Amino acid sequence: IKVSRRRWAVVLVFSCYSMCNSFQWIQYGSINNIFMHFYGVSAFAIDWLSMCYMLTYIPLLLPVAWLLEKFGLRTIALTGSALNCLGAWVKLGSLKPHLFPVTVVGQLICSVAQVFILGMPSRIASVWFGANEVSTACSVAVFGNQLGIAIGFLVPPVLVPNIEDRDELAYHISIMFYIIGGVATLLLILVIIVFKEKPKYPPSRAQSLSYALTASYLGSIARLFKNLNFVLLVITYGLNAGAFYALSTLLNRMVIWHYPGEEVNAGRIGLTIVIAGMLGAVISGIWLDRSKTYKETTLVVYIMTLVGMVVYTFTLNLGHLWVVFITAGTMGFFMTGYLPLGFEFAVELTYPESEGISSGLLNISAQVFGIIFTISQGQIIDNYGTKPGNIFLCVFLTLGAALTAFIKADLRRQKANKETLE
Numbered sequence: 552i553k554v555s556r557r558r559w560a561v562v563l564v565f566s567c568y569s570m571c572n573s574f575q576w577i578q579y580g581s582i583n584n585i586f587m588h589f590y591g592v593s594a595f596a597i598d599w600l601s602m603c604y605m606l607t608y609i610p611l612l613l614p615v616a617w618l619l620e621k622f623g624l625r626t627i628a629l630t631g632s633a634l635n636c637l638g639a640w641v642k643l644g645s646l647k648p649h650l651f652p653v654t655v656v657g658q659l660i661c662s663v664a665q666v667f668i669l670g671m672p673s674r675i676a677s678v679w680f681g682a683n684e685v686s687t688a689c690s691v692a693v694f695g696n697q698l699g700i701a702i703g704f705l706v707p708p709v710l711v712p713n714i715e716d717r718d719e720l721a722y723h724i725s726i727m728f729y730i731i732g733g734v735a736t737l738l739l740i741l742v743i744i745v746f747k748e749k750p751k752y753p754p755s756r757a758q759s760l761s762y763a764l765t766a767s768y769l770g771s772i773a774r775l776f777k778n779l780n781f782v783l784l785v786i787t788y789g790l791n792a793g794a795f796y797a798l799s800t801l802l803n804r805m806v807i808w809h810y811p812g813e814e815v816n817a818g819r820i821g822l823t824i825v826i827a828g829m830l831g832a833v834i835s836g837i838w839l840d841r842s843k844t845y846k847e848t849t850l851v852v853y854i855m856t857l858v859g860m861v862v863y864t865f866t867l868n869l870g871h872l873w874v875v876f877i878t879a880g881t882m883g884f885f886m887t888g889y890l891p892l893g894f895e896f897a898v899e900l901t902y903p904e905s906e907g908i909s910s911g912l913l914n915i916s917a918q919v920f921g922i923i924f925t926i927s928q929g930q931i932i933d934n935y936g937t938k939p940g941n942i943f944l945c946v947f948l949t950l951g952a953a954l955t956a957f958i959k960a961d962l963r964r965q966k967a968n969k970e971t972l973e
């Protein structure tokens with residue numbers, strides 16, 4: 552058993568094109584106010600580009616899990632990157648006001664690329680890393696996806712100003728499409744040369760035993776719903792992660808609703824939410840490494856998310872840009888930091904079930920509730936304004952906060968750990 556230098560190269564290249572793919576998810580959402588003008592469509596149409604990532608994940612996750620089990624790690628890496636690259640190049644042919652379905656086709660291809668991407672941050676961690684480095688590698692791969700949202704918020708409004716000239720607008724969006732298409736192609740070329748089917752030597756004793764050994768997905772998902780505590784977590788995780796998806800997808804229509812212009816700052820706020828959550832996730836992760844208070848920390852963070860969501864809901868109105876930056880970062884510290892926290896707490900209640908099944912069902916719950924939230928809050932924003940849409944998120948987070956309080960600390964991994972110790 553030996554570890555290899557290439558393990559980091561695989562992580563960064565995956566994290567780079569996972570960042571690239573998550574760039575394309577919010578690519579339209581981060582500059583939603585302008586893509587409305589370019590294609591001449593209503594708001595609900597553009598969020599579907601971010602929502603088609605969410606709608607496609609639900610039915611195709613199980614077939615993609617089947618593909619990974621047969622064709623291995625590398626083919627999913629190539630297929631995810633190639634579809635991300637192909638979807639990026641397709642968007643070049645959509646640079647006209649009358650070619651909106653073309654970018655939908657391209658975004659669907661990128662959305663079909665996501666199921667090959669979000670499923671294997673933890674999968675790469677087990678294949679390439681030793682036991683102590685799995686949690687470090689898994690975080691970096693996941694934070695790469697989050698960094699894509701942050702970079703996908705900051706960059707697109709810098710490249711594309713708000714201009715009503717259709718032809719100059721087509722010119723700037725082309726540059727973003729060219730860079731993202733160029734970056735995806737470069738990453739695809741990198742994926743071809745650095746990704747390998749298997750390491751040279753097994754990286755850990757756990758991985759070596761897996762290779763030496765070598766239940767089903769249908770059986771695992773069936774037994775998981777027996778655990779009431781896990782069922783409660785899935786509903787609450789979807790209530791929180793789905794709220795973040797709706798908040799980030801609709802962030803343009805609310806920040807620019809009260810602040811005309813300020814597309815570049817609205818991207819920074821989106822970056823601030825994601826970046827603060829990245830800092831908040833690390834703090835919570837290290838805190839759990841010493842305290843192991845998985846239930847108490849999760850409930851406090853969920854409550855702090857509710858207070859963070861409530862405070863941002865009522866501070867968005869006064870019109871002070873800096874206070875919106877502070878509370879969005881304060882909310883993101885807990886709301887975005889909960890996203891990796893929920894996966895860690897899910898393994899607590901589901902050990903020894905594999906992380907893939909637990910993360911996948913939480914991912915489905917995030918997609919399902921995100922779509923419900925995005926559609927509903929989108930209709931609430933149009934019909935009743937931005938604050939009721941945010942309060943609508945607060946109500947479900949209040950329900951999520953109350954529901955998490957009834958979750959019992961059935962930390963079966965902790966029981967298993969102390970059983971091995973004694």
Ligand SMILES: C[N+](C)(C)CCO
Binds near residue numbers: 573576696918
């Ligand atoms: C998971 N993302 C936020 C990257 C897209 C929605 O599924």
